[PDB]
Amino acid sequence: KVNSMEAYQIPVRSNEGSGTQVFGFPLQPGYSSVFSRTLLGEILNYYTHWSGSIKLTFM
Amino acid sequence: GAQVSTQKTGAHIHYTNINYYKDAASNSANRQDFTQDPGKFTEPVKDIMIKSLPALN
Amino acid sequence: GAQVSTQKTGAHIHYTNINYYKDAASNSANRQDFTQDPGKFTEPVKDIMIKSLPALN
Amino acid sequence: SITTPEEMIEKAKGETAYLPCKFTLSPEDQGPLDIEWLISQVIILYSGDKIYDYYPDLKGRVHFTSLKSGDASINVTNLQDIGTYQCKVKKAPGVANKKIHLVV
Amino acid sequence: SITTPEEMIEKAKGETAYLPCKFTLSPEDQGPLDIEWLISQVIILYSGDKIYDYYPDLKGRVHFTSLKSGDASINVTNLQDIGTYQCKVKKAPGVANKKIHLVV
Amino acid sequence: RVADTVGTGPTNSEAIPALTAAETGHTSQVVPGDTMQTRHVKNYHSRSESTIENFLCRSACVYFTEYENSGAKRYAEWVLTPRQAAQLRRKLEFFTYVRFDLELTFVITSTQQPSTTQNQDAQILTHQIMYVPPGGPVPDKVDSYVWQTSTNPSVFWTEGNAPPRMSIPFLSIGNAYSNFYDGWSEFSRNGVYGINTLNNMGTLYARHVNAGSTGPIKSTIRIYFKPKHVKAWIPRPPRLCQYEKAKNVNFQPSGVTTTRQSITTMT
Amino acid sequence: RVADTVGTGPTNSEAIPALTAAETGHTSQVVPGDTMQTRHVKNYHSRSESTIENFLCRSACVYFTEYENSGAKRYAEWVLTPRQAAQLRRKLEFFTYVRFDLELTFVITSTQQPSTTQNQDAQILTHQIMYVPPGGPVPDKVDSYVWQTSTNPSVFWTEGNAPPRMSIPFLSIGNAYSNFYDGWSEFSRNGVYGINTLNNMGTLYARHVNAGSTGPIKSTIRIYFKPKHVKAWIPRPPRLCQYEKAKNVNFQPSGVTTTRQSITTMT
Amino acid sequence: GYSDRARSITLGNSTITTQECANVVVGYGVWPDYLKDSEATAEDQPTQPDVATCRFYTLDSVQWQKTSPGWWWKLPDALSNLGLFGQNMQYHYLGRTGYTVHVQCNASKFHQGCLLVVCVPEAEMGCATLDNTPSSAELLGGDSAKEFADKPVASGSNKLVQRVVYNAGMGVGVGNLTIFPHQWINLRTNNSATIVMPYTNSVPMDNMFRHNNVTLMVIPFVPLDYCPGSTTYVPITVTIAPMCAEYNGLRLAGH
Amino acid sequence: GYSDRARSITLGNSTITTQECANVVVGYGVWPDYLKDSEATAEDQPTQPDVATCRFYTLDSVQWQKTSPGWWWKLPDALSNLGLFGQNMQYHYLGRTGYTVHVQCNASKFHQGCLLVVCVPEAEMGCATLDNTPSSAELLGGDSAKEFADKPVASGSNKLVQRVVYNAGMGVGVGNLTIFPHQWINLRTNNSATIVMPYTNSVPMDNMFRHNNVTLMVIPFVPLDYCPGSTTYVPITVTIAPMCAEYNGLRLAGH
Amino acid sequence: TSDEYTAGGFITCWYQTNIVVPADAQSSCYIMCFVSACNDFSVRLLKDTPFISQQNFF
Ligand SMILES: CCCCCCCCCCCCCCCC(=O)O
Ligand SMILES: CCCCCCCCCCCCCCCC(=O)O
């Protein structure tokens, strides 16, 4: 998926259940494979310490 | 003609500086310039969007 | 903007100092800071104990 | 830092010997990982993300239990094998090693 | 900077092969000009504002199309000549080179 | 200095700070106090080390070359360009246009090369570094009349002291250095495409003033750039693909990021 | 300045300064004038040299290592830690938490090693010292692209001048350095136990910029720490047992003190 | 009492009206204006048509299929052959101008898709070959779509441009392209996207024919989907309007 | 200018946000508060966590089929094993608290259904047998659905509870259950229902383990319907949030 | 850098209810996630990124 535009997409669908997990990942903004390549994550890779809050928007 | 400024200290001192050249590209760097304005990159819209109100009504 | 302070002399002189950096972790050490408060380690009790009176009466 | 660097394991013959070398990479340590098992002269070698199977008696007997995560243990079998095994894990900034004594 | 340094030219036999090496001199580059054509060992050489005609098979076949202006191309003939031609233009501050592959 | 967190309480109202539209660029300006109860926390953290000046103003090696005191290679040359290295180039390519003064530092070190001559008692070596502007005469050899440096700025250094440092003013015909150029130098649109068209920084020459011995010696010079008084405009995303050439942005397509095991995997 | 002794006389009263209870921590605040007759004596002695700043602020070697200019060992590395030595460590372990700026000094000396090469006429050696923060790239070899030091702080030194000295600000994510930690890094409580968990000071790399000759040469670097602007909290007793490792407080049980002959013996 | 979803834009003799829209993005907070007297360098007087150029020009539409990577356009090169804007830039040596990009894509409630509309200044693009550079008429397209391509372009001796959508032809992450003014078209809500861009350059005026100030990119992050029965042909249309355009250095025509 | 259909509720470290809703019902006009000093009887000081209990707990979902009678939950018994709310009530002898019930059921325009959400104080329920009384673990369910049943439960020697939907297990008309605070979920309009209930009892504090203050009931007056093709699995989810909770009489754990 | 003393947490997403879709519409949808910082973010200790790698002078 990393070699495709599919990596960005989170697939949701209709299932005969409830309470199933969609996704999950750890909170490591500079180190986690999920955030290492984002603008904020790339900026963090030039620094040793980080401290603040983090906004996550879902569309 | 010396300039006295403040040192970078922690929270919770002055230093002296004189310019010895006549070129203005010989001075030291400008490290204490703390000014931000993210209203250009973030919130770059025409009609102001209040936080509490809905985005598209 | 220079600071003039006192030298360490015997009992029974001033010196000059200027800060040349803008970092506050570049200055010299603080050797003349003579302040004590042993009431924490010694006498660490709640009810004050006078010297002349008995300890436990 | 490999936990319990000095350790002695007593295992009966005819039972696979389990040797554990769990380690915790330092934040300072950010280099290529190398895991080497010595028998006191090597039984197995992990280097450049590749596992190589060195010792004629223990050939086809020594295999890893898990490495990238932080576990570099081995499970030996067909004990006859009395000796001291030194697990040496290498990171470019820092290095650590654990020695296990196996009886019978 | 020679345009299209990596290029492949397919030309039929009995047709003169046209090889183009156009370049743009840098403002920084202000030195004596040298243009050398290599066949992979030289077919032609331009140096000190003089053209020298090196290769026995291509003798009397290789000639420049235009050099001072900025065009250093050659027009070969009587193809039989499969090989790689490297056009190397030299200025005292900076140098550039273009390789052309000719089939048949 | 950073903003301090305030204190909110339980709320039941029609206000919707969280719900918004990302179709508009409008990056939501919500704070934690809008989706939970928070306590008042004074924040003495200061946004000081993140400024562009503190980010860019550090020396960084951009090119190291060799020369000898005998034989064929007797002097060294290098057109001024910061794209030779990767670390300085990547940091500068966060922005489209930059405008900064430059501080130049050199590190020159010699090494006695293997030979078979005898009785080698060398003397102190002096090295001369000379700059040629776009259009100035360039030295054909090591004893050319160009080194007279009547107008070109030059510097002489005797091996053993503190390195030589000089400061250079913003040199450009434009109003800002351009890290990225989309276009051509020729109107016909058939020639050099890219930043190469805009660049014109001249050439730098370094050499031994004296031989100093009968045996061979090879000197090496390392150049260090420090941007001062920096201004920067229009930020752009960091380079993912590894660099290939110094003249262009030619790259090889690569993965957007590294891969894990599942979508619910925590490692 | 110390207190001056006063003068008392003969006394017959119900006051009991001497008699007290050591069950309570209350260290008796009695003075000689309470159990004898004293004369008035002004005391000009000053409690100045005993302050924590004068106690800790002195340079102290913490680690010395070697490298060569040929062969296999071509550069040196050392994770920053003050527990390598015993003298600096014992003094710092009088307190639980310390907070101080650090002044760093280096002493680099070379030595010509035994060999059989001929005609060795060496040049001046330049050495580069580079710091890698917890997470920075580390040099695989002596000619790695890491030494470009675009952002990492580095220092270059030419053999023969005054040693190189730099000043380092309090670097910590906490509010004080911790000399002793009782706990684990992992919640499951099964891993590294001790201060090792908290420590994260990065790595230091030193090397020869140039070879300088055809014969072998071995350089050695010694590192010197000086704590400045010191603050200290919660004092604790000095180390009796000799140190064994650098990561932990592992010790061998030893005698409380030395022995004499009798209980009434004066020697 | 009206709805913020409705907007109208009037320029020259042209108008556009939207029933559903998000908002208007105004570049870097700057509204495009003319060149001041303290920032100019050319001496001779500029021409300013003011109405014959600053209007809406509508480029050719492009079909959005279920497997389309994306499209890109050079704003100076696109309006080169359209109306009087093209004629003025042809005769003159120096041209300075600003633009707006209204992208329209309308679908029904059942259709689901996502499009990213971003303007990239100095969007220099790389060649498939590492040694040579992208040829013109391969990177540039006159009123043409110029689509991208999933998967790398083959490496050989050819001035072909690398069209990978995930690297976007610039070697940077496609996701991080939100640093420049961007607007999202969500079929379920947004129908069109409006972006206003002020003139951005390191010099006061530049030759329009040999240099491109900005590159418009339309990239479908989420594909187009529907059920058997619904309409398959779903087009995207682009209209550009030069704002506060001025020209200098009149001479013989050509380039 | 906003829409009254949008609401947000923030309690503790939790939030809920609705796009479509009716309103908020506030019990008997009373907002839940703490116990005054002139109404209290216990002498020892109360504990008030204030954040670790007063947040949103989300119970297990239930599938709404085309033939579901209805479901009921005991609010004190439901949060007995959830979070710190359960732990505090376990150790303490006396507990006083108020609640809110946000019920969420989302369906498409084509789906049609009606649900009644009502809170019943002292909802004593009857047994199938006329001589014996309903057994525990038959009336009560831990985080469990506890659905009703069309048609009477068989009469025999068994502590089974009468689950008739039309009598509702209390022997009263199902329609007249609108006397207590009630909210209606209409799939064609309302998506969720919010009800705020103040503490209601004949005494200041009561033992949570042996007594239930209120019973939440969800009853589909109009069945669920759709056409072949639309989604069949349609779940209902319930979140409860204790408000102004206080406890007294700390002792050994158990019940 | 990856550390165990200063651990972050976990971020997960579950189905509060179920996706409801009518007939003649697609039942397989996608979500997209954007990340940013609040107005209280800070960074320290300038270092070198581990991402770029130069084999030789280009
Ligand atoms: C002995 C005198 C030496 C003087 C040499 C001066 C050379 C100055 C070179 C400046 C190069 C600046 C390039 C910046 C390019 C960019 O930012 O994109
Ligand atoms: C060339 C630049 C070198 C810079 C190196 C900086 C290294 C700083 C190391 C600080 C270590 C302080 C450890 C204190 C531990 C304690 O007090 O318990």
Side-chain angles (χ1 to χ4, degrees):
Chain A
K1 263 78 173 184
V2 288
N3 297 342
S4 299
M5 291 279 294
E6 304 182 6
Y8 298 100
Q9 311 164 8
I10 307 177
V12 308
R13 43 164 291 192
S14 180
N15 58 0
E16 299 297 357
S18 50
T20 316
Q21 202 184 4
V22 172
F23 70 77
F25 48 82
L27 178 68
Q28 294 178 123
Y31 177 81
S32 176
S33 63
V34 189
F35 296 118
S36 49
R37 291 311 192 160
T38 68
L39 271 173
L40 169 66
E42 276 155 334
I43 293 184
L44 290 172
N45 277 101
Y46 282 101
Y47 292 97
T48 310
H49 310 141
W50 72 272
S51 180
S53 318
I54 290 297
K55 287 195 293 250
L56 273 182
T57 315
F58 310 89
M59 187 164 61
Chain B
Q3 310 117 45
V4 177
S5 203
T6 36
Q7 287 199 325
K8 173 72 176 182
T9 59
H12 184 270
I13 322 181
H14 288 103
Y15 77 98
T16 325
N17 166 270
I18 306 189
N19 300 5
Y20 307 89
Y21 301 88
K22 31 188 174 180
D23 282 307
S26 319
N27 318 331
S28 300
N30 308 130
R31 306 257 187 173
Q32 314 170 317
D33 181 317
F34 311 131
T35 302
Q36 332 164 22
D37 180 41
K40 305 179 183 301
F41 322 110
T42 84
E43 54 197 352
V45 287
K46 189 176 185 295
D47 171 11
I48 185 165
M49 291 172 51
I50 301 311
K51 192 202 314 178
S52 318
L53 301 162
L56 296 180
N57 200 41
Chain C
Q3 310 117 45
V4 177
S5 203
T6 36
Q7 287 199 325
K8 173 72 176 182
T9 59
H12 184 270
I13 322 181
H14 288 103
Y15 77 98
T16 325
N17 166 270
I18 306 189
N19 300 5
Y20 307 89
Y21 301 88
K22 31 188 174 180
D23 282 307
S26 319
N27 318 331
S28 300
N30 308 130
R31 306 257 187 173
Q32 314 170 317
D33 181 317
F34 311 131
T35 302
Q36 332 164 22
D37 180 41
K40 305 179 183 301
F41 322 110
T42 84
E43 54 197 352
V45 287
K46 189 176 185 295
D47 171 11
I48 185 166
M49 291 172 51
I50 301 311
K51 192 202 314 178
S52 318
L53 301 162
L56 296 180
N57 200 41
Chain D
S1 308
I2 311 182
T3 317
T4 330
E6 179 174 334
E7 176 165 338
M8 188 153 62
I9 294 179
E10 190 172 2
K11 212 70 170 185
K13 185 183 181 305
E15 313 277 0
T16 74
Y18 177 63
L19 297 158
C21 185
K22 182 188 303 295
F23 55 91
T24 308
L25 295 182
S26 302
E28 302 126 325
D29 296 3
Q30 300 290 141
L33 185 67
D34 164 65
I35 302 159
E36 200 178 10
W37 276 86
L38 264 296
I39 174 180
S40 185
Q41 209 193 177
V42 276
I43 41 185
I44 204 172
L45 174 61
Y46 172 73
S47 182
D49 185 7
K50 203 165 189 59
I51 310 175
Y52 307 103
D53 167 15
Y54 283 126
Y55 204 77
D57 176 45
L58 291 197
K59 182 76 178 183
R61 295 182 180 179
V62 181
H63 46 264
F64 277 120
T65 314
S66 305
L67 307 176
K68 173 86 71 167
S69 304
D71 294 352
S73 317
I74 62 166
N75 191 25
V76 200
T77 185
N78 211 346
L79 297 188
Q80 183 178 185
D81 285 10
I82 319 181
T84 302
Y85 303 80
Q86 177 173 4
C87 167
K88 183 177 301 181
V89 173
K90 169 78 67 58
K91 255 281 180 170
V95 58
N97 38 242
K98 169 179 181 169
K99 305 177 185 178
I100 303 90
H101 314 83
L102 193 165
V103 184
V104 170
Chain E
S1 308
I2 311 182
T3 317
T4 330
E6 179 174 334
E7 176 165 338
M8 188 153 62
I9 294 179
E10 190 172 2
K11 212 70 170 185
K13 185 183 181 305
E15 313 277 0
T16 74
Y18 178 63
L19 297 158
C21 185
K22 182 188 303 295
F23 55 91
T24 308
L25 295 182
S26 302
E28 302 126 325
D29 296 3
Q30 300 290 141
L33 185 67
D34 164 65
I35 302 159
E36 200 178 10
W37 276 86
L38 264 296
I39 174 180
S40 185
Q41 209 193 177
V42 276
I43 41 185
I44 204 172
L45 174 61
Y46 172 73
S47 182
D49 185 7
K50 203 165 189 59
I51 310 175
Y52 307 103
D53 167 15
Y54 283 126
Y55 204 77
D57 176 45
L58 291 197
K59 182 76 178 183
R61 295 182 180 179
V62 181
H63 46 264
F64 277 120
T65 314
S66 305
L67 307 176
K68 173 86 71 167
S69 304
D71 294 352
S73 317
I74 62 166
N75 191 25
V76 200
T77 185
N78 211 346
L79 297 188
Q80 183 178 185
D81 285 10
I82 319 181
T84 302
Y85 303 80
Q86 177 173 4
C87 167
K88 183 177 301 181
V89 173
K90 169 78 67 58
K91 255 281 180 170
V95 58
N97 38 242
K98 169 179 181 169
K99 305 177 185 178
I100 303 90
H101 314 83
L102 193 165
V103 184
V104 170
Chain F
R1 190 195 268 195
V2 311
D4 308 352
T5 313
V6 290
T8 79
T11 307
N12 189 322
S13 77
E14 301 179 0
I16 34 179
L19 287 179
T20 185
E23 285 80 19
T24 73
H26 199 275
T27 300
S28 55
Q29 301 288 106
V30 316
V31 283
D34 294 335
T35 43
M36 50 185 299
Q37 307 190 32
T38 40
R39 60 160 310 165
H40 182 235
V41 178
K42 300 180 180 180
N43 290 349
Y44 311 105
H45 309 94
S46 177
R47 283 179 176 182
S48 56
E49 201 172 349
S50 39
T51 73
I52 59 171
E53 190 96 15
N54 293 279
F55 180 53
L56 285 172
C57 192
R58 285 200 173 180
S59 277
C61 177
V62 299
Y63 202 65
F64 78 76
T65 170
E66 288 98 359
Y67 44 99
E68 289 238 6
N69 76 337
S70 66
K73 169 100 166 177
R74 294 277 283 101
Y75 64 104
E77 64 170 2
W78 173 60
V79 168
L80 280 312
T81 186
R83 298 167 179 90
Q84 284 285 349
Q87 291 182 347
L88 178 49
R89 184 179 181 181
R90 183 175 139 111
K91 277 176 61 181
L92 274 175
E93 292 190 340
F94 271 52
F95 316 95
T96 326
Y97 313 111
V98 293
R99 162 179 183 109
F100 56 86
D101 297 342
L102 186 69
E103 205 187 39
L104 252 177
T105 314
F106 306 99
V107 171
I108 322 176
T109 53
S110 305
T111 291
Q112 163 209 348
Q113 298 304 306
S115 88
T116 169
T117 85
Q118 300 178 356
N119 324 312
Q120 305 163 195
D121 165 75
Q123 313 262 340
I124 314 181
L125 284 172
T126 312
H127 313 265
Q128 172 183 353
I129 313 173
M130 178 188 187
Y131 170 68
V132 166
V138 298
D140 190 32
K141 41 201 176 178
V142 77
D143 49 51
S144 180
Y145 76 85
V146 178
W147 306 93
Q148 290 184 357
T149 67
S150 75
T151 302
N152 296 138
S154 163
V155 74
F156 295 81
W157 189 67
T158 317
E159 243 185 19
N161 302 355
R165 175 185 283 187
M166 69 278 304
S167 195
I168 318 292
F170 174 78
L171 307 173
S172 199
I173 62 190
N175 296 70
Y177 291 113
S178 268
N179 301 316
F180 294 92
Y181 180 80
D182 186 4
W184 290 265
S185 61
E186 305 180 19
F187 311 91
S188 302
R189 302 159 147 182
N190 193 14
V192 187
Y193 167 79
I195 194 46
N196 197 18
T197 69
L198 249 53
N199 188 262
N200 190 18
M201 309 304 168
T203 321
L204 191 67
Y205 286 83
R207 67 149 186 178
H208 287 133
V209 177
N210 54 319
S213 89
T214 66
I217 287 167
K218 186 192 287 176
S219 181
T220 312
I221 176 179
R222 308 173 185 254
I223 298 113
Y224 288 92
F225 275 23
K226 179 204 217 91
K228 269 156 40 180
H229 307 294
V230 199
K231 277 193 132 199
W233 292 275
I234 303 189
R236 48 207 308 109
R239 192 54 174 262
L240 211 173
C241 298
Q242 305 291 321
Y243 290 113
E244 307 289 344
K245 336 285 299 185
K247 309 283 184 58
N248 43 31
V249 301
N250 286 187
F251 59 95
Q252 297 174 180
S254 58
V256 158
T257 184
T258 52
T259 175
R260 48 183 179 176
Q261 179 68 30
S262 191
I263 191 170
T264 74
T265 283
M266 294 290 173
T267 51
Chain G
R1 190 195 268 195
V2 311
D4 308 352
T5 313
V6 290
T8 79
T11 307
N12 189 322
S13 77
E14 301 179 0
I16 34 179
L19 287 179
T20 185
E23 285 80 19
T24 73
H26 199 275
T27 300
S28 55
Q29 301 288 106
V30 316
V31 283
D34 294 335
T35 43
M36 50 185 299
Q37 307 190 32
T38 40
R39 60 160 310 165
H40 182 235
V41 178
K42 300 180 180 180
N43 290 349
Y44 311 105
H45 309 94
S46 177
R47 283 179 176 182
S48 56
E49 201 172 349
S50 39
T51 73
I52 59 171
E53 190 96 15
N54 293 279
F55 180 53
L56 285 172
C57 192
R58 285 200 173 180
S59 277
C61 177
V62 299
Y63 202 65
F64 78 76
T65 170
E66 288 98 359
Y67 44 99
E68 289 238 6
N69 76 337
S70 66
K73 169 100 166 177
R74 294 277 283 101
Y75 64 104
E77 64 170 2
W78 173 60
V79 168
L80 280 312
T81 186
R83 298 167 179 90
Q84 284 285 349
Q87 291 182 347
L88 178 49
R89 184 179 181 181
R90 183 175 139 111
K91 277 176 61 181
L92 274 175
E93 292 190 340
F94 271 52
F95 316 95
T96 326
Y97 313 111
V98 293
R99 162 179 183 109
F100 56 86
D101 297 342
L102 186 69
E103 205 187 39
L104 252 177
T105 314
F106 306 99
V107 171
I108 322 176
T109 53
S110 305
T111 291
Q112 163 208 348
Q113 298 304 306
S115 88
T116 169
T117 85
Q118 300 178 356
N119 324 312
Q120 305 163 195
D121 165 75
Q123 313 263 340
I124 314 181
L125 284 172
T126 312
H127 313 265
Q128 172 183 353
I129 313 173
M130 178 188 187
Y131 170 68
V132 166
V138 298
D140 190 32
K141 41 201 176 178
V142 77
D143 49 51
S144 180
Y145 75 85
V146 178
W147 306 93
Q148 290 184 357
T149 67
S150 75
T151 302
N152 296 138
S154 163
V155 74
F156 295 81
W157 189 67
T158 317
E159 243 185 19
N161 302 355
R165 175 185 283 187
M166 69 278 304
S167 195
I168 318 292
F170 174 78
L171 307 173
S172 199
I173 63 190
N175 296 70
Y177 291 113
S178 268
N179 301 316
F180 294 92
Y181 180 80
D182 186 4
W184 290 265
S185 61
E186 305 180 19
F187 311 91
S188 302
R189 302 159 147 182
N190 193 14
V192 187
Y193 167 79
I195 194 46
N196 197 18
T197 69
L198 249 53
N199 188 262
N200 190 18
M201 309 304 168
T203 321
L204 191 67
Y205 286 83
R207 67 149 186 178
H208 287 133
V209 177
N210 54 319
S213 89
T214 66
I217 287 167
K218 186 192 287 176
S219 181
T220 312
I221 176 179
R222 308 173 185 254
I223 298 113
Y224 288 92
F225 275 23
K226 179 204 217 91
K228 269 156 40 180
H229 307 294
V230 199
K231 277 193 132 199
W233 292 275
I234 303 189
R236 48 207 308 109
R239 192 54 174 262
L240 211 173
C241 298
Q242 305 291 321
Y243 290 113
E244 307 289 344
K245 336 285 299 185
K247 309 283 184 58
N248 43 31
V249 301
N250 285 187
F251 59 95
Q252 297 174 180
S254 58
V256 158
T257 184
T258 52
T259 175
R260 48 183 179 176
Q261 179 68 30
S262 191
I263 191 170
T264 74
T265 283
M266 294 290 173
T267 51
Chain H
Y2 52 90
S3 180
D4 56 3
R5 301 297 306 265
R7 184 165 282 277
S8 92
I9 309 179
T10 293
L11 273 185
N13 59 44
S14 68
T15 308
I16 71 181
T17 51
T18 73
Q19 312 298 319
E20 293 181 1
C21 74
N23 211 335
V24 182
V25 162
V26 189
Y28 290 100
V30 171
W31 199 267
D33 202 358
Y34 283 110
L35 187 44
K36 296 262 151 282
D37 314 78
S38 38
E39 319 261 335
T41 176
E43 268 149 12
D44 47 74
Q45 171 118 40
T47 199
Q48 293 170 3
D50 230 349
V51 267
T53 77
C54 313
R55 46 176 306 278
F56 275 103
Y57 299 95
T58 296
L59 301 177
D60 300 2
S61 299
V62 281
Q63 191 204 350
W64 183 4
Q65 337 199 37
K66 287 196 185 189
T67 47
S68 276
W71 309 266
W72 89 79
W73 300 271
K74 298 288 190 297
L75 296 191
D77 181 54
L79 301 182
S80 66
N81 274 359
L82 277 177
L84 269 174
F85 179 85
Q87 295 300 323
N88 283 289
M89 92 183 211
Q90 198 154 333
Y91 281 87
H92 293 90
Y93 164 51
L94 287 176
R96 174 183 202 274
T97 180
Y99 314 89
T100 302
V101 303
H102 192 261
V103 175
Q104 302 175 180
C105 189
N106 62 283
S108 77
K109 295 298 192 70
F110 300 67
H111 284 85
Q112 72 190 47
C114 203
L115 269 196
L116 162 64
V117 181
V118 61
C119 298
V120 191
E122 315 289 4
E124 191 179 351
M125 305 213 157
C127 175
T129 301
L130 300 180
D131 294 359
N132 66 47
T133 54
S135 71
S136 66
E138 169 66 28
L139 189 54
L140 270 61
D143 185 13
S144 283
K146 277 306 171 190
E147 41 180 341
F148 284 108
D150 302 358
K151 294 177 181 301
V153 178
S155 181
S157 54
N158 38 28
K159 289 178 294 302
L160 293 181
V161 46
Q162 196 82 238
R163 300 201 313 267
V164 271
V165 57
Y166 42 96
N167 288 204
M170 314 183 309
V172 307
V174 53
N176 309 341
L177 268 178
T178 51
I179 187 65
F180 312 109
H182 72 287
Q183 191 146 338
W184 290 89
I185 306 187
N186 199 358
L187 292 190
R188 74 186 309 264
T189 309
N190 205 15
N191 288 358
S192 304
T194 53
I195 309 159
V196 175
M197 194 80 195
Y199 173 83
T200 52
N201 205 348
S202 67
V203 292
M205 284 190 177
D206 208 335
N207 193 196
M208 295 192 163
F209 270 96
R210 78 171 165 193
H211 180 234
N212 298 146
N213 271 48
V214 44
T215 296
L216 170 70
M217 288 176 180
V218 174
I219 307 172
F221 268 76
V222 176
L224 185 73
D225 217 2
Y226 46 83
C227 293
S230 48
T231 321
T232 68
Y233 196 95
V234 180
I236 308 167
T237 308
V238 197
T239 85
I240 322 289
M243 281 182 164
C244 300
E246 34 188 338
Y247 306 91
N248 251 154
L250 182 63
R251 40 134 181 92
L252 73 149
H255 52 86
Chain I
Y2 52 90
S3 180
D4 56 3
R5 301 297 306 265
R7 184 165 282 277
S8 92
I9 309 179
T10 293
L11 273 185
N13 59 44
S14 68
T15 308
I16 71 181
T17 51
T18 73
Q19 312 298 319
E20 293 181 1
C21 74
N23 211 335
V24 182
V25 162
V26 189
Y28 290 100
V30 171
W31 199 267
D33 202 358
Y34 283 110
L35 187 44
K36 296 262 151 282
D37 314 78
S38 38
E39 319 261 335
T41 176
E43 268 149 12
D44 47 74
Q45 171 118 40
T47 199
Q48 293 170 3
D50 230 349
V51 267
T53 77
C54 313
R55 46 176 306 278
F56 275 103
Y57 299 95
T58 296
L59 301 177
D60 300 2
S61 299
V62 281
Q63 191 204 350
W64 183 4
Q65 337 199 37
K66 287 196 185 189
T67 47
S68 276
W71 309 266
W72 89 79
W73 300 271
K74 298 288 190 297
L75 296 191
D77 181 54
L79 301 182
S80 66
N81 274 359
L82 277 177
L84 269 174
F85 179 85
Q87 295 300 323
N88 283 289
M89 92 183 211
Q90 198 154 333
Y91 281 87
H92 293 90
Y93 164 51
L94 287 176
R96 174 183 202 274
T97 180
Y99 314 89
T100 302
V101 303
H102 192 261
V103 175
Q104 302 175 180
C105 189
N106 62 283
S108 77
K109 295 298 192 70
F110 300 67
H111 284 85
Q112 72 190 47
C114 203
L115 269 196
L116 162 64
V117 181
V118 61
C119 298
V120 191
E122 315 289 4
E124 191 179 351
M125 305 213 157
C127 175
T129 301
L130 300 180
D131 294 359
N132 66 47
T133 54
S135 71
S136 66
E138 169 66 28
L139 189 54
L140 270 61
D143 185 13
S144 283
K146 277 306 171 190
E147 41 180 341
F148 284 108
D150 302 358
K151 294 177 181 301
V153 178
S155 181
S157 54
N158 38 28
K159 289 178 294 302
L160 293 181
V161 46
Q162 196 82 238
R163 300 201 313 267
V164 271
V165 57
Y166 42 96
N167 288 204
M170 314 183 309
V172 307
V174 53
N176 309 341
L177 268 178
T178 51
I179 187 65
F180 312 109
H182 72 287
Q183 191 146 338
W184 290 89
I185 306 187
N186 199 358
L187 292 190
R188 74 186 309 264
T189 309
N190 205 15
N191 288 358
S192 304
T194 53
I195 309 159
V196 175
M197 194 80 195
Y199 173 83
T200 52
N201 205 348
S202 67
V203 292
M205 284 190 177
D206 208 335
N207 193 196
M208 295 192 163
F209 270 96
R210 78 171 165 193
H211 180 234
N212 298 146
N213 271 48
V214 44
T215 296
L216 170 70
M217 288 176 180
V218 174
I219 307 172
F221 268 76
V222 176
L224 185 73
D225 217 2
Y226 46 83
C227 293
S230 48
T231 321
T232 68
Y233 196 95
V234 180
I236 308 167
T237 308
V238 197
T239 85
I240 322 289
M243 281 181 164
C244 300
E246 34 188 338
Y247 306 91
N248 251 154
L250 182 63
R251 40 134 181 92
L252 73 149
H255 52 86
Chain J
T1 318
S2 180
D3 197 9
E4 183 50 283
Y5 184 69
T6 51
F10 312 90
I11 314 151
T12 54
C13 187
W14 312 77
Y15 283 97
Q16 178 71 24
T17 53
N18 185 26
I19 292 296
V20 181
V21 274
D24 291 311
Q26 283 284 311
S27 88
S28 284
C29 324
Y30 293 124
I31 315 179
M32 288 214 320
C33 187
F34 306 95
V35 70
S36 51
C38 277
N39 66 355
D40 50 17
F41 212 79
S42 320
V43 287
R44 279 193 327 188
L45 253 177
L46 277 152
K47 77 175 204 292
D48 273 7
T49 187
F51 293 145
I52 210 64
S53 295
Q54 176 186 11
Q55 171 67 31
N56 257 342
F57 282 126
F58 315 120

